[PDB]
């Protein structure tokens, strides 16, 4: 339950990061499902990528 | 990649609250064979909870 909640919360944040493109979001989310123990690292990577793609 | 795609689409649905989204993800994990039914249920709930 803990991991499913973690990936649900992290996944929701990832898909709502406004500067990511759809393939980037989908790739992070697929990685989340494949290895939920990486949720914090994937969220952090996604946020950094999002910030580098700011207008 | 059917289960992964359903997970992705569930996470994208804007009008689910956190408890509802978490519950769908848990159900997907518990029985991935039901991905299409769960996604359809989630979509229905999403549309019913559109801001009015």
Author numbering:
A (entry chain B): 3 to 57
B (entry chain A): 7 to 58
Article passage:
The three orthogonal mutants, LL2.c17 (VFLV/IVVY), LL2.c7 (LVLF/FIVK) and LL2.c22 (IVFF/FILV), were selected to compare differences in their affinity and structures. Each Z-A mutant binds to its binding partner with nanomolar affinity (3.98 to 44.2 nM) but has minimal cross-reactivity with other monomers. The backbone structures of the three mutants are relatively similar (Cα r.m.s.d. of Z-A after aligning Z-B ranges from 0.447 Å to 0.641 Å). The dimer interactions of LL2.c17 have sharply diverged from the other two LL2 mutants, with the Phe13A-centered hydrophobic patch surrounded by multiple rewired hydrogen bonds, an additional hydrogen bond between Asn11A and Phe32BTyr, and α-helix 2 of Z-A was slightly shifted to generate new interactions with helix 1 of Z-B, which explains the significantly improved affinity between these two proteins compared to the original pair. Binding of VFLV/IVVY and LVLF/FIIV are highly enthalpically favored and entropically disfavored, but by the end of the trajectory we see a more moderate enthalpy of binding coupled with a moderately disfavored entropy in IVFF/FILV. For example, A-LILFK has more Z-B binding partners (B=77) than A-LIFFK (B=15) from the LL1 library, and A-LVLF (B=53) and A-VFLV (B=42) are also more cross-reactive than A-IVFF (B=3) from LL2 library sequence data.
